[PDB]
């Protein structure tokens, strides 16, 4: 399949084990699946403060 | 930094030129706010 990668910036490259979840990106011809940010080799998004759970980002402790 | 997957197949003569005749460097024309392609059925907040 082909899978979208949401969030700004990603660490993925060839031979990078990832989890996909389903959900199509409308504008892209043929993409029916999103990667899960924060599962397996895929990193969480850097410096996200809102909707963090969607982008696999942990709560910044202060 | 991810690679752009161009629609040209195997580029032979010149890369830049090929790119130029590609969707990535397609023309973009803006929608008119007033004038010709200007009518909006519903507002941005309508």
């Amino acid at each position: 399949v082909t899978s979208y990668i949401g969030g700004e910036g990603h660490n993925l490259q060839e031979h990078s084990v990832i989890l996909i979840r389903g959900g199509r990106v409308k504008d892209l011809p043929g993409v029916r699946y999103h990667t899960v940010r924060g599962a397996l080799d895929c990193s969480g998004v850097k410096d996200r403060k809102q909707a963090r759970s969607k982008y696999g980002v942990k709560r910044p402790k202060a | 930094m991810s690679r752009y997957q161009h629609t040209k197949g195997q580029i032979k003569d010149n890369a830049i030129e090929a790119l130029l005749h590609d969707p990535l460097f397609r023309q973009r024309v803006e929608k008119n706010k007033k004038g010709k392609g200007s009518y909006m059925r519903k507002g941005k907040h309508g």
Binding site: - | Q10, I16, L19, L20, H21, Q27, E30, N32
Partner: protein, 362 residues
């Protein structure tokens, strides 16, 4: 001395710019470590390494040393400027001026070295301009770009020559190739290779919308067409033998057929068209020659293709400049220099962008 003062003021700035582009501190550090390594006696046991290290060092040293000199010379000039002005000693003033000139020259040399390091950078070039996907607007943009380039070249001193031009049926030009002769023409222009992005309200649109059209420039140097040297008799292996079928006793006996073979490449050419062995050989030889040429061409193609592929890998980064004429700002995307005098730039004031690019090494 007003001009002199101005020059002095400029020179420091120039030096600073050079330093910035060079990444001077890093270079210095490299020189240091390398120097240390050289000083250590164990490095020269491995010969290949040592020579390489030496090679690395010297250039770095030169770069640093020159920079250092630039710092000092200017200061000296400044010091002597006062003398020239107030004390009114003429000879001293003259000396200072001379020093400045020398220093300036030195600076130029370093900057020249930095800029025009490539092999073909001295040669003349073919600027190739190709319009984008838009239609009329794109063509117009391309034409404008071409005009700008022409203006630039003339200003520089270069001899322009419109080799080929495809015109747009309504307005502007569809494509154009321009031979640009002069010393260091390729090295000056090579940076302009890339996609150029116009943004403006289209005059050809009936709606009058804002259009964002692209157009490619592509600068390549005039390489000397190296002659196709003939192959050696030692490189070839030549069989001769009987032919297939035919008719007679004579034919059965004689070895007219000829099979030439390249030992390096493993290519072969047979011939048995003629009765005469010699003729066949000649034909066969010709064929072989042709084949070699074709192989050389194939090789050339393949290499080129690799390069093309590599270039493609940059993708959206092939876009080097952004001419926004609605908001009136030109920006070079790779270097980051901006100017609000769009019109001026169009007319052919690319030195500001070009020079910076050269300095960068991009």
């Amino acid at each position: 001395i007003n001009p002199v003062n101005n020059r002095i003021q400029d020179l420091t700035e120039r030096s600073d710019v050079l330093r910035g582009y060079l990444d001077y501190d890093a270079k210095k550090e490299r020189l240091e470590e390398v120097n240390a390594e050289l000083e250590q006696p164990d490095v020269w046991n491995e010969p290949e390494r040592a020579q390489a290290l030496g090679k690395e060092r010297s250039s770095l040293e030169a770069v640093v040393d020159t920079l250092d000199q630039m710092k000092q010379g200017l200061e000296d000039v400044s010091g002597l400027l006062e003398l020239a002005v107030e004390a009114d000693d003429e000879e001293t003033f003259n000396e200072a001026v001379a020093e400045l000139d020398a220093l300036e020259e030195k600076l130029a040399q370093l900057e020249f070295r930095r800029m025009f390091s490539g092999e073909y950078d001295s040669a003349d070039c073919y600027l190739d301009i190709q319009a984008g996907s838009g239609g009329t607007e794109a063509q117009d943009w391309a034409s404008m770009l071409e005009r700008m380039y022409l203006r630039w070249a003339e200003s520089r001193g270069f001899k322009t020559e419109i080799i080929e031009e495809s015109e747009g049926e309504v307005a502007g030009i569809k494509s154009v190739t321009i031979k640009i002769s002069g010393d260091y023409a390729y090295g000056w222009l090579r940076t302009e290779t890339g996609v150029h992005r116009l943004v403006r309200k289209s005059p050809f649109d009936s709606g009058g919308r804002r259009h964002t059209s692209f157009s490619s420039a592509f600068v390549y140097p005039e390489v000397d067409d190296d002659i196709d040297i003939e192959i050696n008799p030692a490189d070839l292996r030549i069989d001769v033998y009987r032919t297939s079928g035919a008719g007679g006793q004579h034919v059965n006996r004689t070895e007219s057929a000829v099979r030439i073979t390249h030992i390096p490449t493993g290519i072969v050419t047979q011939c048995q068209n003629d009765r005469s062995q010699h003729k066949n050989k000649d034909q066969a030889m010709k064929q072989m020659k042709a084949k070699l040429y074709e192989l050389e061409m194939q090789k050339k193609n393949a290499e080129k293709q690799a390069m093309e592929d590599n270039k493609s890998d940059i993708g959206w980064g092939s876009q080097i400049r952004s001419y926004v004429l609605d908001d009136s700002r030109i920006k070079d995307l790779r270097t980051g220099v901006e100017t609000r005098n769009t019109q001026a730039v169009l007319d052919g004031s690319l030195d500001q962008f070009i020079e910076a690019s050269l300095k960068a090494g991009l």
